[PDB]
Amino acid sequence: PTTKPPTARKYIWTNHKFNVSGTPQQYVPYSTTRKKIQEWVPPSTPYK
Amino acid sequence: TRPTIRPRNDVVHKQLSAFGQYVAEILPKYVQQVQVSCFNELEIFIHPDGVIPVLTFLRDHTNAQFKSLADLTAVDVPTRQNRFEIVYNLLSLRFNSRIRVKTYTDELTPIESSVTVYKAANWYEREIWDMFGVFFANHPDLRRILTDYGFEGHPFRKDFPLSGYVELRYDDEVKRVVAEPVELAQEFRKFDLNSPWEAFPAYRQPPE
Amino acid sequence: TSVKPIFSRDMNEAKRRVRELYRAWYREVPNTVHLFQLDISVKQGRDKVREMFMKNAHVTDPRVVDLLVIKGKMELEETINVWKQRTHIMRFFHETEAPRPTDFLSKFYVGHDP
Amino acid sequence: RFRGEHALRRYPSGEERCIACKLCEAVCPAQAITIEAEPRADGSRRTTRYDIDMTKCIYCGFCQEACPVDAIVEGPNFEFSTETHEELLYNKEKLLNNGDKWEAEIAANIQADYLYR
Amino acid sequence: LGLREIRIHLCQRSPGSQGVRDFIEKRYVELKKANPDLPILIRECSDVQPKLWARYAFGQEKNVSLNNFSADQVTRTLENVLSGK
Amino acid sequence: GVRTSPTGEKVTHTGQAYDDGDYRRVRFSDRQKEVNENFAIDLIAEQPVSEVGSRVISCDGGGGALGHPRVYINLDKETKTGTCGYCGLQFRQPHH
Amino acid sequence: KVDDAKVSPPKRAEMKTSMESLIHHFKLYTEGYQVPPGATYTAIEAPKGEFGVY
Amino acid sequence: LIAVDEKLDITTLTGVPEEHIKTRKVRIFVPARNNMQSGVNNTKKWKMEFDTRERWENPLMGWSSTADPLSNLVLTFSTKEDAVAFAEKNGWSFDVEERKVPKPKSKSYGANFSWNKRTRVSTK
Amino acid sequence: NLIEVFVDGQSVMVEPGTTVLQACEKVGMQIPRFCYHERLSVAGNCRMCLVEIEKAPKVVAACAMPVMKGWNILTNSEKSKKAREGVMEFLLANHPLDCPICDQGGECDLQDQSMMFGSDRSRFLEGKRAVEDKNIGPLVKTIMTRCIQCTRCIRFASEIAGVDDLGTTGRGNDMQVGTYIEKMFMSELSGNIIDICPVGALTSKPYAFTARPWETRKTESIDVMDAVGSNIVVSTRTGEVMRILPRMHEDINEEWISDKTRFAYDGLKRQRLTQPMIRNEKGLLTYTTWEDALSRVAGMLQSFQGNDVAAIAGGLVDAEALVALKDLLNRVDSDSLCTEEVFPTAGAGTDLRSNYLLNTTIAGVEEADVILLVGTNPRFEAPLFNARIRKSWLHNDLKVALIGSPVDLTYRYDHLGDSPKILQDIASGNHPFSQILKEAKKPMVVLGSSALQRSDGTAILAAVSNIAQNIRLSSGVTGDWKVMNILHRIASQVAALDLGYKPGVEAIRKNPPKVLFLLGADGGCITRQDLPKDCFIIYQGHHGDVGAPMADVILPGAAYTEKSATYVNTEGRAQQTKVAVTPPGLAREDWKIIRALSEIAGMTLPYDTLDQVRSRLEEVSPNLVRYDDVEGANYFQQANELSKLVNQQLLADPLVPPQLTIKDFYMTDSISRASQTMAKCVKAVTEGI
Numbered sequence A: 001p002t003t004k005p006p007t008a009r010k011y012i013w014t015n016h017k018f019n020v021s022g023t024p025q026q027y028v029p030y031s032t033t034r035k036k037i038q039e040w041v042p043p044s045t046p047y048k
Numbered sequence B: 001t002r003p004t005i006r007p008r009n010d011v012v013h014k015q016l017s018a019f020g021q022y023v024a025e026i027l028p029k030y031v032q033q034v035q036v037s038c039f040n041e042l043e044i045f046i047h048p049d050g051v052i053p054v055l056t057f058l059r060d061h062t063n064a065q066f067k068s069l070a071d072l073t074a075v076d077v078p079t080r081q082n083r084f085e086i087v088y089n090l091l092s093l094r095f096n097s098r099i100r101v102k103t104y105t106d107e108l109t110p111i112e113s114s115v116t117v118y119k120a121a122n123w124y125e126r127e128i129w130d131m132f133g134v135f136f137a138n139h140p141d142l143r144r145i146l147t148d149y150g151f152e153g154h155p156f157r158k159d160f161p162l163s164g165y166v167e168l169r170y171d172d173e174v175k176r177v178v179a180e181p182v183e184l185a186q187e188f189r190k191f192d193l194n195s196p197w198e199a200f201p202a203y204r205q206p207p208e
Numbered sequence C: 001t002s003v004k005p006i007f008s009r010d011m012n013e014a015k016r017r018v019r020e021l022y023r024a025w026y027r028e029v030p031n032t033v034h035l036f037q038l039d040i041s042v043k044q045g046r047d048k049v050r051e052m053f054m055k056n057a058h059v060t061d062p063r064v065v066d067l068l069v070i071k072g073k074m075e076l077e078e079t080i081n082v083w084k085q086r087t088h089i090m091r092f093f094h095e096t097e098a099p100r101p102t103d104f105l106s107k108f109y110v111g112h113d114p
Numbered sequence D: 001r002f003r004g005e006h007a008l009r010r011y012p013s014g015e016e017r018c019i020a021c022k023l024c025e026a027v028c029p030a031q032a033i034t035i036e037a038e039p040r041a042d043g044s045r046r047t048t049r050y051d052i053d054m055t056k057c058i059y060c061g062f063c064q065e066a067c068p069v070d071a072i073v074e075g076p077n078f079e080f081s082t083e084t085h086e087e088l089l090y091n092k093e094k095l096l097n098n099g100d101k102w103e104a105e106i107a108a109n110i111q112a113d114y115l116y117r
Numbered sequence E: 001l002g003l004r005e006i007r008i009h010l011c012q013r014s015p016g017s018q019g020v021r022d023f024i025e026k027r028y029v030e031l032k033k034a035n036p037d038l039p040i041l042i043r044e045c046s047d048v049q050p051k052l053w054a055r056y057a058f059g060q061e062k063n064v065s066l067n068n069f070s071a072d073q074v075t076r077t078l079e080n081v082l083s084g085k
Numbered sequence F: 001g002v003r004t005s006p007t008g009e010k011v012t013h014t015g016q017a018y019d020d021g022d023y024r025r026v027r028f029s030d031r032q033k034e035v036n037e038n039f040a041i042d043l044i045a046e047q048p049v050s051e052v053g054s055r056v057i058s059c060d061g062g063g064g065a066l067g068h069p070r071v072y073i074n075l076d077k078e079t080k081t082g083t084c085g086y087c088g089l090q091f092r093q094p095h096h
Numbered sequence G: 001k002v003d004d005a006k007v008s009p010p011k012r013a014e015m016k017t018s019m020e021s022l023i024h025h026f027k028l029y030t031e032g033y034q035v036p037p038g039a040t041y042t043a044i045e046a047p048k049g050e051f052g053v054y
Numbered sequence H: 001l002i003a004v005d006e007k008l009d010i011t012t013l014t015g016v017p018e019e020h021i022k023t024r025k026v027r028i029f030v031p032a033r034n035n036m037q038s039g040v041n042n043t044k045k046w047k048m049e050f051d052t053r054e055r056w057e058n059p060l061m062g063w064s065s066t067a068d069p070l071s072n073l074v075l076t077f078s079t080k081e082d083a084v085a086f087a088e089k090n091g092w093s094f095d096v097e098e099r100k101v102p103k104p105k106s107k108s109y110g111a112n113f114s115w116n117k118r119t120r121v122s123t124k
Numbered sequence I: 001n002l003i004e005v006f007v008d009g010q011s012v013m014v015e016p017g018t019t020v021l022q023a024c025e026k027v028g029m030q031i032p033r034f035c036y037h038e039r040l041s042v043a044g045n046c047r048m049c050l051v052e053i054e055k056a057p058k059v060v061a062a063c064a065m066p067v068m069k070g071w072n073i074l075t076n077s078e079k080s081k082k083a084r085e086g087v088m089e090f091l092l093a094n095h096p097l098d099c100p101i102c103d104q105g106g107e108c109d110l111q112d113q114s115m116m117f118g119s120d121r122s123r124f125l126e127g128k129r130a131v132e133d134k135n136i137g138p139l140v141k142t143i144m145t146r147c148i149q150c151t152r153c154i155r156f157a158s159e160i161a162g163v164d165d166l167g168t169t170g171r172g173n174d175m176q177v178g179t180y181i182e183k184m185f186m187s188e189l190s191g192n193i194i195d196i197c198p199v200g201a202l203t204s205k206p207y208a209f210t211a212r213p214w215e216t217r218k219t220e221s222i223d224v225m226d227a228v229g230s231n232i233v234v235s236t237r238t239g240e241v242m243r244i245l246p247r248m249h250e251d252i253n254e255e256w257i258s259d260k261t262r263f264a265y266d267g268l269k270r271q272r273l274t275q276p277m278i279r280n281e282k283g284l285l286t287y288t289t290w291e292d293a294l295s296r297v298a299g300m301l302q303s304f305q306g307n308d309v310a311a312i313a314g315g316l317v318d319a320e321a322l323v324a325l326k327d328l329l330n331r332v333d334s335d336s337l338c339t340e341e342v343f344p345t346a347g348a349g350t351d352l353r354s355n356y357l358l359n360t361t362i363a364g365v366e367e368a369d370v371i372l373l374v375g376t377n378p379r380f381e382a383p384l385f386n387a388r389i390r391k392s393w394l395h396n397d398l399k400v401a402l403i404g405s406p407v408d409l410t411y412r413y414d415h416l417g418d419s420p421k422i423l424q425d426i427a428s429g430n431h432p433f434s435q436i437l438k439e440a441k442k443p444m445v446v447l448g449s450s451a452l453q454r455s456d457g458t459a460i461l462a463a464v465s466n467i468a469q470n471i472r473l474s475s476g477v478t479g480d481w482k483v484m485n486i487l488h489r490i491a492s493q494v495a496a497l498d499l500g501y502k503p504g505v506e507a508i509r510k511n512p513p514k515v516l517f518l519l520g521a522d523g524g525c526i527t528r529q530d531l532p533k534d535c536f537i538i539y540q541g542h543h544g545d546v547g548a549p550m551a552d553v554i555l556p557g558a559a560y561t562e563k564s565a566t567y568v569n570t571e572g573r574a575q576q577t578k579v580a581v582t583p584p585g586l587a588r589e590d591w592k593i594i595r596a597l598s599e600i601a602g603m604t605l606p607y608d609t610l611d612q613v614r615s616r617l618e619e620v621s622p623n624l625v626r627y628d629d630v631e632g633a634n635y636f637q638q639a640n641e642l643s644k645l646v647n648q649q650l651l652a653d654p655l656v657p658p659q660l661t662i663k664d665f666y667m668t669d670s671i672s673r674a675s676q677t678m679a680k681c682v683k684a685v686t687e688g689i
């Protein structure tokens, strides 16, 4: 890398990270999609 | 020249056609059809109860020394009355040739076991029974070969689901592996790939 | 029509084969309970054998009955030779499956299943 | 040519290369890719969900052959063993993080091997 | 005791429904005129025998087979239901 | 451009964030949420608009065979920029 | 590879330049190529003996 | 050869669970042409498919889950009679849909230029 | 007589005028094509269907060339193959490299026919053409660089939809398809240009980028937005409705669907009822359990009986739910069963089906000589019926006359007044249209169901029956042609009337009920000011619109995409929707809900499965279980004789349809009101641009 440095981008990580498994920095999966179906919110004002 | 097209061998096509006519003449009682595919493969369709005579002839005859059984398998075609199609692939070392013999059967009709002709038929027919449900009559030891002990159903039939009906896990309450109905965290996503436009006119079927 | 008989030409011969297989399975339950070190009773094993025999009591085809006794003989020889483990013998009992509701109201409460 | 951990790449501008065309999902032998897309706030064709089950993946590299924009790649990383099964079910944020961490080496490898493709 | 509706199921083509067709053709309008508030629903069967359903109070239903009846016999069977005998 | 939900949870570039009453937030306790900080929409908006003096331009994303399939964009509507829809790049004709 | 884009994929540069090549890349990697109907048994001399596919 | 007069029934031999034999109604049909394309090659054979069951969302990863073994099972038959016989011998309930074929149509290019009829087109 | 031609040497017997393409279709060969559609006129401009005749030195356009006697058509000859390769080369020469970002994706005819009939390599070494993108509204997205100038959208727009706003401007390689001005192509049949466009030039805007064709599973159901009962295909993906596509049925749907049918599936993801709801001590609706809600409802149902129990059925209810609710209310001797749609009960009433059916079927419009529309706007009440009328108009010079308000149908018609006094005049014989009807060989009278909602619906029905009787007497008595027709606009109306529901809510108004079951009743016909004080209301449904806000107990149900259900269309045909997805949350099937409620209340209904419910439907009305059948008996004589008895005076008001414009078309039912795409359509057609 000293002789042939890699191409620099603004989004490439500045600091490298090792494997963070077994630590509070470990990856936890989740669904990245929003809620498919919206339910109906009843009125807050009483009737009859 | 045509660099991207597979060349053909009309000499081998002629030799295979001649031998197919030869066999069809010698065994009129069982041979129903003979075909030669254009990549030079001879195929003989026989009545299902001529398995032992036809195989013994193809093994012992001087002009057909098919001493080796390359394979034995079945194909499931639910649209047919006899859905199962038993396929025998024979190899002749003396004449450096290969032949195929095809038979049909259904669920409740047995096929005579050919272990008296070829010894490889033993495990081949055990696998056919295990995976398709075809029973072979005089088989020395016919039982499951590939499926789990007590596995119910024959998985290679077209109507069998890909993931089956049960799945295994270890249960701590009973301290043993248990079998429970199948349940998938992500269901297999079935893709419809077939194009609505015809690809090969040469195989077009009559509108009927 | 004139279909090929696999083992039995009539339903009486098929019933005879069924009775022979039932005798074989009945006489093997004590040995199976002893060898596999199961925690069930011999009476429970015999009741399971009867129940498994009895869920095919609606069959009226001698060929289907012949195939059923063939498969029963195969799974009897898997038990005798101890090819099966305690796992499979106990798989005959479904000791871990939850009791599935059978009434309309319970099914309606649980979910969408018919 | 080595096929290791997967990554989602970006253009030099920082824009994601993936256009949610689902060719990788179609070609994946192991059905290890799950993709869901919708128009972005600027109208771009972009993914909202891009999952790869690394416990289902067979590391065959078909997804980067089938990608028309060089978005999904199989990077050089091979030392990414975890302690729980759930940590091996990557999502879009994890794959973009992998791309950002490994972009220099990924770019160098693609430059070295793109004339054989 | 309290009749709530009548339904007549007659197939459109079968010979067994010929009498029921004649009753509808010539005698239905008078019947509907005498009983304006009684729902007399005429529907069509496919290949089964003609039938007469009478729905009473609290969901009690009786079915009478009209197969191979005559036009006057259908009238008599229908008047038995309305009368009660 | 990351943003924080009212529950303290970071919001992803797709807008994902667990509700306050959602039980599924328990999985992040004593752990973290994997969120990529760079937003492609923000970066591509930060990109400037190129001006070329032709009705039709071509974009291949830069790099040639290392970009995207080459497409042609018609710069005739004077009320908007032509956007390459593979890479989201804006082009325009010199006005005034 | 066989110079037949209806069976083998085109090059990446051709795919990113040619309309026919892009179409064929898309179709090959999403649907695949159709094989004419038929059954074959082909065997080779694998190191463990005859390895065959029907 | 023996003579037995029974309807073929292989449910006891197929190994399917009782609920998936008895609570399932298959649909025998010819697929409708995909309206997005003009090809008619996918409307040649009859299909047999099962009724849709429940799919839910996985708590982790939000994938689509299922508990129905016969969800992706589709069988191809050359004839309605073959499909019905297969369903009958396997013991499933079935609903048959008669095949829909486009009716013959009278097309005439010269109709676009009628002297007195409304078929004359205003543009080409 | 039939002439003999040969396709690849095989003999075909074809009628004179049959084209080469149709003869090849007859022997089973589908010739490639882009500009040819069998529902549109013949263009012959894409030149993709060129074939070789045996002795002809020149290739012919198969789509526009009538066959001559003794022609041999060489469909797989060298000349034909080279012609296809050349044409495909030109098309792909100017096409853009947009396949990965194109919704046409795996369902593109350019791609499929390029893989089948074209070359695998490109010789084009020039620059491509880029075309400016037009804007024609919120439904159709135009990316016109992908257009292949096949002019299907122009022909479809003009001929089918009666809108001449599309055309080709300029000439040469720079010829463009569009409006030439910023005008929106808004019509009730606008998505069919999305369907017929072979390429990705016209794509669905709601469906944009969401899925790919291979992913989707296809469920064949029917449409419930109107009473035509159009056949559709629901495209789902991982348990989610993704798209609605047409399904061919040449006697109902004929490959087209309306915009409300196609683009209102977005309303199935909003305002959904997902859990049972009751009211707490504060009177606010709160979530509860199925057992709790059903126990409350069953307690009230056991408390009351007689005509103190009413049910109002809405427009999206199915035969199974209707018959289950009818049985449940009959178990308590109650009978206040009604629909929120009025039909005249004076005379024959609902006793004879050929008194509220569309007796001349949808396909029967194609044989009529004269058609008289009374008090309806078929363009918005039943867009496919109006499309059939326009098709018959164009291809048979059908004379259409409309009595009442002068709405804009897509074809020229003869306007007659605005008042039912014209209807009185025609029956007498004063009007010239009386002579036209008398001399017509096949007349048809269609009375819109919206006109029967007036205070004088019985009088209008009597007047039109008098007109039909006059037609029958003067013209031929014999024949199977039927003149009298009624066009419905509600999906559940015909099924309810068959089951024996009392049309309209007059019974509820007359005897206000203590307990009221609103089964999908979102029309707001009956409200709490009509009901007695402390009335108990159970709203069973799938959207929270009106009944849910006013209800005491809320029971979530299933939609047509989520239940297998039976619906009877306006011509009396019965069809069944299949299950595409499952009901969300704790929502259940409607008949299952009613059956569970009956079992809890102690009056258990005698059916436990869908087959048993269908058997009960067969007991009540067998036509509900005869599905594709449409043939029925005609009782016009009895109906007319019973109608002559009681007559009222026609109101002196003009016959004004409820829907006069396309916005009124867009916002019709609960799902349409919940949809956001329909809101966008309303905004676009109201505020323009």
Ligand code: SF4
Residues within 6 Å of the ligand: D024, D027, D028, D029, D030, D031, D032, D033, D052, D056, D057, D058, D059, D060, D061, D062, D063, D064, D074
């Ligand atoms: S490497 Fe192969 S198995 Fe893994 S995600 Fe890519 S295509 Fe799928």
Ligand code: SF4
Residues within 6 Å of the ligand: D017, D018, D019, D020, D021, D022, D023, D024, D025, D035, D063, D066, D067, D068, D069, D070, D071, D072, I100
């Ligand atoms: S093939 Fe590439 S661009 Fe297409 S969906 Fe996959 S990662 Fe995205």
Ligand code: SF4
Residues within 6 Å of the ligand: G023, I095, I096, I097, I098, I099, I102, I103, I104, I105, I108, I109, I110, I111, I146, I198, I199, I200, I201
């Ligand atoms: S219209 Fe067809 S060929 Fe053209 S870019 Fe779209 S998918 Fe590709």
Ligand code: SF4
Residues within 6 Å of the ligand: I146, I147, I148, I149, I150, I151, I152, I153, I154, I177, I196, I197, I198, I199, I201, I202
């Ligand atoms: S927009 Fe589509 S339908 Fe219209 S001419 Fe172009 S390719 Fe044909």
Ligand code: FES
Residues within 6 Å of the ligand: I032, I033, I034, I035, I036, I043, I044, I045, I046, I047, I048, I049, I050, I061, I062, I063, I064
């Ligand atoms: S299909 Fe005949 S020229 Fe277009």
Ligand SMILES: [Mg+2]
Residues within 6 Å of the ligand: I104, I193, I194, I195, I196, I197, I198, I199, I200, I201, I202, I203
């Ligand atoms: Mg299109």
Ligand SMILES: [Zn+2]
Residues within 6 Å of the ligand: F059, F060, F061, F062, F068, F084, F085, F086, F087, F088, F089
């Ligand atoms: Zn670009």
